[PDB]
Amino acid sequence: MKIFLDTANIDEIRTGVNWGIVDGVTTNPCLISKEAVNGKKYGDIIREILKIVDGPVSVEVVSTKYEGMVEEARKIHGLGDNAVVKIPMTEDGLRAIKTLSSEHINTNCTLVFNPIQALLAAKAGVTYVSPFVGRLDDIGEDGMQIIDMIRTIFNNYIIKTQILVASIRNPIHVLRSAVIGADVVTVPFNVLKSLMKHPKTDEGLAKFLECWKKVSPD
Amino acid sequence: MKIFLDTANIDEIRTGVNWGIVDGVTTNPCLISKEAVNGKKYGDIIREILKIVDGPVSVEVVSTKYEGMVEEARKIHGLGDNAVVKIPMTEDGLRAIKTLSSEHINTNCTLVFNPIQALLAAKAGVTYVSPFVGRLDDIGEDGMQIIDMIRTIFNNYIIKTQILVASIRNPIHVLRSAVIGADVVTVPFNVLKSLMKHPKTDEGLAKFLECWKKVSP
Amino acid sequence: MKIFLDTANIDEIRTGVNWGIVDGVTTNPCLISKEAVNGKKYGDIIREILKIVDGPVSVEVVSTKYEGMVEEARKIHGLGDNAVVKIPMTEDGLRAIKTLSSEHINTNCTLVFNPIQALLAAKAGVTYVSPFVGRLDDIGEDGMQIIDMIRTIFNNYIIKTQILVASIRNPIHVLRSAVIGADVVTVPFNVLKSLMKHPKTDEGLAKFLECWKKVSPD
Amino acid sequence: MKIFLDTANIDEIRTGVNWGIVDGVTTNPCLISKEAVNGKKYGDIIREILKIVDGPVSVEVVSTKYEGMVEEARKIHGLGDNAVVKIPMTEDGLRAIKTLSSEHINTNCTLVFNPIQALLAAKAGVTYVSPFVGRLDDIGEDGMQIIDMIRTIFNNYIIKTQILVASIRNPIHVLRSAVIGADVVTVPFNVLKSLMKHPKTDEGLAKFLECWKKVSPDGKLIL
Amino acid sequence: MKIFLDTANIDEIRTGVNWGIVDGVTTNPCLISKEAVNGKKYGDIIREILKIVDGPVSVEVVSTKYEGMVEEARKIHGLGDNAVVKIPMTEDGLRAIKTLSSEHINTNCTLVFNPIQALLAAKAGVTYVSPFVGRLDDIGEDGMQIIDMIRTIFNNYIIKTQILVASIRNPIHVLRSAVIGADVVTVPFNVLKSLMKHPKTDEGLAKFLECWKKVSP
Amino acid sequence: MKIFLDTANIDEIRTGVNWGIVDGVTTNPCLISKEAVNGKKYGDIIREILKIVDGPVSVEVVSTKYEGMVEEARKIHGLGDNAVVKIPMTEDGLRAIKTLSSEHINTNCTLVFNPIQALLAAKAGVTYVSPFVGRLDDIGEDGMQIIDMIRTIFNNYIIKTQILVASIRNPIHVLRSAVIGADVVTVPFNVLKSLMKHPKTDEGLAKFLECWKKVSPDGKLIL
Amino acid sequence: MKIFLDTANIDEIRTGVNWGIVDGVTTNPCLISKEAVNGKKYGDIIREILKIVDGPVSVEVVSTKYEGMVEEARKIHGLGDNAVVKIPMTEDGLRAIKTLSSEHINTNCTLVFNPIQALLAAKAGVTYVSPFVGRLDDIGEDGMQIIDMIRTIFNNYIIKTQILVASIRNPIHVLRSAVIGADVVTVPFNVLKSLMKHPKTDEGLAKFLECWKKVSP
Amino acid sequence: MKIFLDTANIDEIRTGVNWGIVDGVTTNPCLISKEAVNGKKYGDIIREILKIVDGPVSVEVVSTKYEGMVEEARKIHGLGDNAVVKIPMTEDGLRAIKTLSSEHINTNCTLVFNPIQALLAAKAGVTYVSPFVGRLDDIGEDGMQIIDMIRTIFNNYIIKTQILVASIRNPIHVLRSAVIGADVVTVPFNVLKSLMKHPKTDEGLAKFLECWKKVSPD
Amino acid sequence: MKIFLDTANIDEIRTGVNWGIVDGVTTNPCLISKEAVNGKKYGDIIREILKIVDGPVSVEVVSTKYEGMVEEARKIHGLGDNAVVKIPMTEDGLRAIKTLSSEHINTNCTLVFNPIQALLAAKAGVTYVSPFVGRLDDIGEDGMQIIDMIRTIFNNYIIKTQILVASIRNPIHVLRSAVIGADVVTVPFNVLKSLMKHPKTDEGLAKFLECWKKVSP
């Protein structure tokens, strides 16, 4: 399972990249606007992420119509070979995805909330589909169940679109994604750093530390 | 999973094809007669649909006898390479499917209501089999369970006939079909249109637009 | 399992009652406005249904604020003992339900889409909760799963609110509701009439009629 | 589980009752006409069955309209207290069941093919509902699955209508009915007779005989 | 779960009763004839068993006709209050069970091989029904599955007939019977003896003895 | 799943073959004697079936001893390449199957009632094994459960013997056989005919006709 | 299922109380320290919540030792009959719970992370047990699993201790607790607000309003 | 599934081979000593079985120490290529199996009662492992559960040791072994002969014989 | 399944090696400190195990920091091609695993307590991952559950990291690991000895011996 970081915070990205466990980054206009303050510009934030991240970097189009989406996508593509054009699950967005896939431009279909939307994105040739588990949790539906169904549907038809679990809120979203077999998770930095941690790991290290000071004082 | 449109309404077909999500069309005599009113002839409607749709277009014979069925099927085949001959699950229909299959004419066996009928159509060499889930729902039986058994049966025998889920009434027939692994669903236009929509998609787009306006008024 | 009719059409209601299989009626502002045409007024339609139907008749309030809802609900209660005041799942609706519950006015919480909303309504003392299965189906979620979870939750706590399956679209919603154990279903007229029918019933009648004629020429 | 005989053959009914394993009889116009040949009247056959059978005897109305059904049902009920009026699952039949239930006339709703039909008959107050499992089998649907769902539905709502499995064709219909917990099965006579038999019962009896002859040549139990 | 001993061997019966784990005895013509050799008469063996065993003792009629069965059953009943009349699952056997049951004479229906036969015996009012699991095992069918279905059937109808698992060959028939919830098992003596034993019981007793010797030589 | 016709009635076999849905025929001495009345010889009936049927035709040996079975089997095999020698599940039958399998004569082991019998026939190299599900149903045991176990066993060991479900009585035997994955069913003609039918197929055809008459009064497809 | 508010914020508590859906309140030293800034002290905060909240309100002891816990618990108890004394799962905590249970002082055992700890607290007589599901989630373990096992255990032994699901982070913690059948959930204010909302509810109200406007302007 | 005969009785073996359903033989010191009476010697019995049986014949060593086991096993190997050296599950037995495995002498690890013992034997390179189902049954544990777990374990690691179900007591051990997928069962003669039999087979023969006589008087 | 010995005791290792069932060895700072008393030092203990054990032998680093881990790992690697460098699940540990994996130095990530930690270590290229089942057992959580999930996860993504079940306390840890399909278990010597023993094995040998004595005195 690949692990992407779901942020536009450059320090978070650099920190997690340095850890070696970050395979890519996903951004969206809301994540970018949180960082484009006090003089920082949306165009520089995107360019810096692309430079620091060896892996896929998803960048969301802001046009809502087919022609504007395809124009933006080609410019986003031109920013670097690792850029992935993020496009929402809409009729115009499915049209844009089909055109871009035929142009060999990698795409990521976002704002997916049920398995049939994910299937429609895959039928257009999308490289990634991003169902939003946490927003389903927010409205009283276990969001991971949709990941499970998408995984079964994709396996039934040998679909090559990668399942990118998005809107992740806690480490159990991550665990269930891995057990289900989703291709990718994208996580906030606070979730990312918790994944390495466990109280019995800490207790174990102090235990070995005290044992090491018995045979080697220094 | 392929998605066909279950209608003869030309406007619906053009709109769905323009959306890029329609892989084929299924018609039947009742769907064609709904459109072939006030001047419009059934022969023009059929031809126009074959012209608009790049993918398979199923056209149903009206004869009930083996000889009439095969002859009508060859006319239908002649209308275009994408024509698929729809044939009902009857004794003559099965004979007709075997003959047409040996002639490499693509066929679709319709009015199937249980898995053994679907198996018989496959054994005659049919290209697609069309079990009607919604008509089973109508009579108090969960139609999707027949799709599940057909998938298992076809998997057991490595059967090449495509399962084409017909008589679809709602998006859960579609979801359950994909989870089962049916090769095709054919859907009325009101169902097709709903498959892309979700209230959280809309709400999320409004959130993104609001964020974008803060950074670029 | 009780079977309500989900309509404001007097003819459909009269027909359904004349069959003896209709235990009550659910209405809402859209159902009523469909009949409030060509002279007929919304108030007369409601009073006409209350008269024809011996069982519970649900009538939705149109106010959105707490005080308007309870004032309306009391006027509705005054139309007859079989009236049930239908109130949406909102913060003001939950307060109204609690107030009207203490006044012994029967209530129906509507526009419920997940099991926790159903629980909150029951906690306010509502007589019926009406989850909308067909509107979940419309958005790619099997609406009957919500009924199943609500049934487990209500059984867990011995909750007396009746589950009233609404937004019903086909006879399998009805079958699954009975298998689950929902207390009530409300069905459009077209669904109700289908519930009695089956081709093997018709075939069987015709066979019986042939055998009877071999022994009785009259 | 009660076991009814699904027939109008007097000799079959006499033999089954003699076995002490028959708790009632179900008839229909087709079973009756099968015996109403060569002078035998339909009413005499019915009256004879009502006579020899202590348990419930289902007799079907021939009218298709509500009024004719309630009229025929009162005549059928007047033939004996063990008569059960058999009524098809139709709009008019439901209305007749409700009327007759309020008049304390026992009813049996027949020609039921899915669980919701069964539920509607229960809601009208019917004494028995008779789903046809063999006719479902004929059209490629496992008929016993409908019995299982009816049992669950009835349990859910504490419904007192008895589930009466009909159109029974083989002993597995009977076994599955008993495992599910249907209240009654009605079986043709050939099915009834097979239910008692098993080759290992026959074998075990032959072995028991051989052993006793080793100890008593005349083959008796002298105590 | 009651545990009966399935034998007519007097020595086995005395040993099992002295152990305090035997609640009853089942005999049959083949079990009695095994002992009634070289002078010993079958009538004495039966009487002696009734005297030794406080609990139910099943004795099988030998007549195959209704009238002969009921008459033999009344003699058997007369031999002692703990006598239970064993009757085979036949048409005459069922008639006989109904008659005897109306006379409050305890009965045991034997040679049962499927759950519907067990149900018929219960409907005749039989006190015990004895399905033969080992003879089903012999013919390639898992006999315990019949016990499971009978338990469910009897539970569905609140049936008072006791399920008496017969033709038991090994301790797993016994274990599965208890887990299912059969009212009774009847077991040959070699099986009965093994039910108390376990190698870890023995090993643990040797450990305890060794500990006790350290504190009190 | 192959579908064989379990009969010796020539007219049934002709009709089934014409439908294009019959892949072979199974016979046995009882089915043949049913048609070998009024001058019809048993050998003529067999030869006629072998003639009209392209697929496998199972003919049963009448000898009960090994030698007579292998002798009859060679005569049966010499009648045509589509003949399959049907042999009972006995000690002598297993020995004959092994011999005939080594002589490349196709065999069908019949009268099988549990999965281990089926396994023994497979180990002797038999081409088909025919478990009798209806006869298991008759004695109160769900016969299809044996098919399910045979399928699992055969899958476990990659056994190439085909599972041929016999003693079929209803369309649910056929449906369950297909869901399990048995290689072949053999069915009586009445069962075969029912498999194509369903009331909703009939209804849907009547509706299609009514719609076309609204658009073409003569009822044709003029293209 | 009862629903408590997991906060010491008076304005959150005051808003949820008015809604009619908050049956009680849980607090802890960290929640109260978040409100005891800028001169506000814990003593007034606790007293004001006990006044607003009709139902149970849990107040945690600060002493880590038995006598301090028990002394502090009687002070907490004296502040109001609805006060429930929160006590951590430790050796001294269990001893304190048992003494307080004998004095009829309602108790709540917190910092419970597995089912056996919860059983231990119930055996001491605790009125509520508070397993922290969110903190199990944090360390890679599905917290709701422990709720499921505690429900089963408590059902097994007919245990009267109420299961109070704590450390709730999202509405699916609430959903799963209701399906399991936990007696209580305690939720943060942001979780509690979301519980009544669903986009199809808002969509439905707009539909009704628009229909009502066509009838009565 | 292979079927071995678990006996040292020449007559039973000869009978079973003459049926063609016996693929080999398992012996042990108790089975052999039962036949080594009235003049017959243990060595002659074994050499006679090796001659009659074309398939694998298991012959148990009598030494308990590593060096005696391998020395015996080599003498046993010298009696014929179809001999299989049976060795108990002990520390010395595991060492012998590993040594004899490298010498390409086929081995059978016997007296196995749980799945980890079976695994350890396979790890030593044993050709067959023989778990004793009936002796587990004797002590109140369903012995077939051990076969099921051993089958899962061997499949997990693609282990080539054949599972040989031993201590078989009835035809359901055989049925469950085949359903599980054990490679081999070894059965006493009384069980083997029952495997072919069934009352419905006999009934069916008699029915066929009656129909044949209606058409052929000879 | 490979079986390693979880000890630094040379006499335990020497005995298990001779048995032919020990495929390797795991050590840790606490196991080695138990043998480095009375003048014996860790350096010789490690070297002597690398000599005896043909298979992999895991040696844990003591530095908590990246550069120290990596430096110590190259020293450990240089002691023998079968040495496997043990590294704890930390930020620096993962970084160290990735560098060492690129240098073709076999690694073992230890102190893993949930499946996502195990996936993180696999993603860094670790050769083995060592989840501690016994220490999960200690804190009231079925440790074997995490092995099950790790097996499933690793199967999902075709992960080559071997699952090495550590902190094993009893033979059922071993049994369940084999049924799950873990690549390796590492066991204490007392657990390893018990694995070959069963009372019915001893009973069976006595039976055979007694029969052999009747044939050949």
- In single-letter form, the type of residue at position B199 comes to P
- Which residue bears the tokens 């889409």? C113
> F119-146 burial, b for 16+ CB within 10 Å, e for fewer?
bbbbbbbbbbbbbbbbbbbbbbbbbbbb
> What is the Cα–Cα distance from B90 to B101, expressed in whole angstroms?
16
Of E113, E67, E59, E57, which Cα lies nearest the Cα of E87?
Answer: E59
Closest Cβ–Cβ partner in B138, B139, B198 for C139: B198
> What is the Cα–Cα distance from G6 to E112, expressed in whole angstroms?
63
Are the C-beta atoms of C109 and C88 separated by less than 8 Å?
Answer: yes
> What is the Cα–Cα distance from D211 to H86, expressed in whole angstroms?
43
Residue H159: is it exposed, middle or buried by C-beta count within 10 angstroms (0-12/13-18/19+)? middle
Residue F9, phi then psi, degrees to nearest 5: -80, 115
Encoded tokens for E26: 């089942």
> What is the Cα–Cα distance from F223 to A197, expressed in whole angstroms?
73
Q: C46-51 — which CB contacts under 8 Å span 24+ positions?
A: C46/C79, C47/C79, C48/C10, C49/C8, C49/C10, C49/C13, C49/C25, C50/C79, C50/C80, C50/C82, C50/C83
> What is the Cα–Cα distance from G63 to C211, expressed in whole angstroms?
90
- Chain C hits for B195, CB-CB cut-off 8 Å, are 140
Residue G143, phi then psi, degrees to nearest 5: -60, -35
Residue I84, phi then psi, degrees to nearest 5: -120, 130
**Sign for the pseudo-dihedral over CA of H146, H152, H158, H163:** positive
Secondary structure (DSSP) of H90-152: SHHHHHHHHHHHHTT--EEEEEE-SHHHHHHHHHTT-SEEEEBHHHHHHTTS-THHHHHHHHH
Encoded tokens for G86: 């929160």
What's the gap between Cα H24 and its chain centre? 7
Q: Within 10 Å of residue G123's Cβ, how many Cβ atoms?
A: 14
Are the C-beta atoms of B120 and F195 separated by less than 8 Å?
Answer: yes
Three-state SS for G159?
A: coil
> What is the Cα–Cα distance from C96 to C66, expressed in whole angstroms?
6
Encoded tokens for D152: 């669950």
Of C76, C82, C56, which Cα lies nearest the Cα of C4?
Answer: C56
8-state DSSP, B188: -
Residue G115: C-alpha distances to residues D157, E33, G4, G132, G150 (Å):
35, 60, 21, 11, 5
Are the C-beta atoms of D88 and D128 separated by less than 8 Å?
Answer: no
Instruction: Give the Cα-Cα-Cα angle F18, F21, F24 (nearest 5 degrees).
Output: 90
Encoded tokens for F134: 């209806």
Report the relative pairing of strands D24-26 and D57-60 from DSSP bridges.
Answer: parallel
- Chain E hits for F140, CB-CB cut-off 8 Å, are 113-117
- In single-letter form, the type of residue at position I157 comes to Y
| List of residues 6+ apart from G55 with CB closer than 8 A | G2, G4, G22, G23, G24, G25, G82
Three-state SS for H55?
A: coil
> H71-102 burial, b for 16+ CB within 10 Å, e for fewer?
ebbeebbebeebbbbbbbbbbbbbbbbbbbee
Secondary structure (DSSP) of chain D: -EEEEE---HHHHHHHHHTT---EEE--HHHHHHH--TT--HHHHHHHHHHH--S-EEEE----SHHHHHHHHHHHHTT-TTEEEEEESSHHHHHHHHHHHHTT--EEEEEE-SHHHHHHHHHTT-SEEEEBHHHHHHTTS-THHHHHHHHHHHHHTT--SEEEEBS--SHHHHHHHHHHT-SEEEE-HHHHHHHT--HHHHHHHHHHHHHHHHH-TT-----
D115 forms beta bridges with none
Q: Which among H41, H65, H86, H200 is annotated as catalytic?
A: H86
Three-state SS for F41?
A: coil
Residue A188: C-alpha distances to residues A13, A183, F143, H135, I21 (Å):
10, 17, 57, 58, 46
The helix (H) or strand (E) run that includes residue H83 is strand H83-88
Are the C-beta atoms of B139 and C198 separated by less than 8 Å?
Answer: yes
3-state secondary structure chain I: CEEEEECCCHHHHHHHHHHCCCCEEECCHHHHHHHCCCCCCHHHHHHHHHHHCCCCEEEECCCCCHHHHHHHHHHHHHCCCCEEEEEECCHHHHHHHHHHHHCCCCEEEEEECCHHHHHHHHHCCCCEEEEEHHHHHHCCCCHHHHHHHHHHHHHHCCCCCEEEEECCCCHHHHHHHHHHCCCEEEECHHHHHHCCCCHHHHHHHHHHHHHHHHHCC
Chains touching chain I at 3 or more Cβ pairs under 8 angstroms? A, E, G, H
Three-state SS for H57?
A: strand
User: End-to-end CA distance of chain F, in Å?
Assistant: 37
> What is the Cα–Cα distance from E81 to E59, expressed in whole angstroms?
12
Instruction: Give the Cα-Cα-Cα angle D13, D15, D21 (nearest 5 degrees).
Output: 85
Secondary structure (DSSP) of F110-179: EEE-SHHHHHHHHHTT-SEEEEBHHHHHHTTS-THHHHHHHHHHHHHTT--SEEEEBS--SHHHHHHHHH
Are the C-beta atoms of G115 and I140 separated by less than 8 Å?
Answer: yes
Encoded tokens for B162: 């495509």
**Sign for the pseudo-dihedral over CA of B37, B39, B43, B46:** negative
Encoded tokens for A65: 């119509």
> What is the Cα–Cα distance from B99 to B126, expressed in whole angstroms?
10
Residues of H with CB under 8 A from a CB of F: 1, 3, 19-21, 171, 174-175, 178-181, 195-196, 198, 200-201, 204-205, 207-209, 211-212, 214-216
Distance of residue B115 Cα from the nearest chain G Cα, in angstroms: 36
Are the C-beta atoms of I89 and I120 separated by less than 8 Å?
Answer: yes
Q: Which residues of D are catalytic?
A: 86
Q: Within 10 Å of residue B203's Cβ, how many Cβ atoms?
A: 16
8-state DSSP, G41: -
> What is the Cα–Cα distance from H3 to A58, expressed in whole angstroms?
62
| List of residues 6+ apart from H37 with CB closer than 8 A | none
Of B175, F175, F191, which Cα lies nearest the Cα of A117?
Answer: B175
> What is the Cα–Cα distance from B88 to I60, expressed in whole angstroms?
72
Distance of residue E179 Cα from the nearest chain H Cα, in angstroms: 12
> What is the Cα–Cα distance from E22 to E45, expressed in whole angstroms?
18
What's the gap between Cα E134 and its chain centre? 13
> What is the Cα–Cα distance from D129 to D132, expressed in whole angstroms?
10
The helix (H) or strand (E) run that includes residue A187 is strand A184-187
Residue B195: is it exposed, middle or buried by C-beta count within 10 angstroms (0-12/13-18/19+)? buried
Distance of residue C211 Cα from the nearest chain D Cα, in angstroms: 5
8-state DSSP, F89: S
| List of residues 6+ apart from H63 with CB closer than 8 A | H69, H71, H72
Using only C-alpha atoms, chain I has a radius of gyration, in whole angstroms, of 19
Encoded tokens for B47: 């031809």
Q: Within 10 Å of residue A63's Cβ, how many Cβ atoms?
A: 16
Dmax over CA atoms of chain F, in Å, equals 71
> What is the Cα–Cα distance from D66 to D130, expressed in whole angstroms?
20
F187 forms beta bridges with F5
> What is the Cα–Cα distance from E163 to C143, expressed in whole angstroms?
45
Closest Cβ–Cβ partner in H140, H175, H199 for E171: H140
- Chain C hits for D132, CB-CB cut-off 8 Å, are 200, 204
- In single-letter form, the type of residue at position B84 comes to V
| List of residues 6+ apart from E10 with CB closer than 8 A | E35, E45, E48, E49, E52
**Cβ C175–B199 below 8 Å, yes or no?**
no
Encoded tokens for A172: 């159990």
- In single-letter form, the type of residue at position G108 comes to N
Residue G27, phi then psi, degrees to nearest 5: -130, 170
Residue of D nearest to B137 (CA): D114
In chain B, beta strands by DSSP E = 2-6, 24-26, 57-60, 83-88, 107-112, 128-131, 162-165, 184-187
Are the C-beta atoms of D117 and D93 separated by less than 8 Å?
Answer: no
E114 forms beta bridges with none
What's the gap between Cα B169 and its chain centre? 13
Q: Which among B34, B41, B86, B197 is annotated as catalytic?
A: B86
> What is the Cα–Cα distance from I127 to I110, expressed in whole angstroms?
11
- Which residue bears the tokens 């009209």? F52
Three-state SS for E128?
A: strand
- Chain C hits for B178, CB-CB cut-off 8 Å, are none
Q: Do chains B and I touch by CB distance (3+ pairs < 8 Å)?
A: no
Of B148, C201, B117, which Cα lies nearest the Cα of F198?
Answer: B117
Residue D180: C-alpha distances to residues D140, D151, D155 (Å):
21, 7, 11
Are the C-beta atoms of E137 and H172 separated by less than 8 Å?
Answer: yes
Question: How determined?
Answer: X-ray
**Angle, helices G115-123/G143-156, rounded to nearest 10 degrees:** 40
Using only C-alpha atoms, chain F has a radius of gyration, in whole angstroms, of 20
**Sign for the pseudo-dihedral over CA of H191, H192, H195, H196:** negative
**Angle, helices F66-77/F91-102, rounded to nearest 10 degrees:** 40
Are the C-beta atoms of D180 and D147 separated by less than 8 Å?
Answer: yes
**Angle, helices E115-123/D171-180, rounded to nearest 10 degrees:** 70
> What is the Cα–Cα distance from F167 to E164, expressed in whole angstroms?
33
Residues of C with CB under 8 A from a CB of B: 134, 137-143, 169-172, 175-176, 194-195, 197-199
Residue A49, phi then psi, degrees to nearest 5: -60, -50
Residue F159: C-alpha distances to residues C166, F3, F73, H88, I68 (Å):
53, 20, 23, 32, 59
Distance of residue F218 Cα from the nearest chain B Cα, in angstroms: 11
C51 in active site: no
Q: A64-72 — which CB contacts under 8 Å span 24+ positions?
A: A64/A90, A64/A92, A64/B205, A65/A92, A66/A92, A66/A95, A66/A96, A66/A99, A69/A93, A69/A96, A70/A96, A70/A99, A70/A100
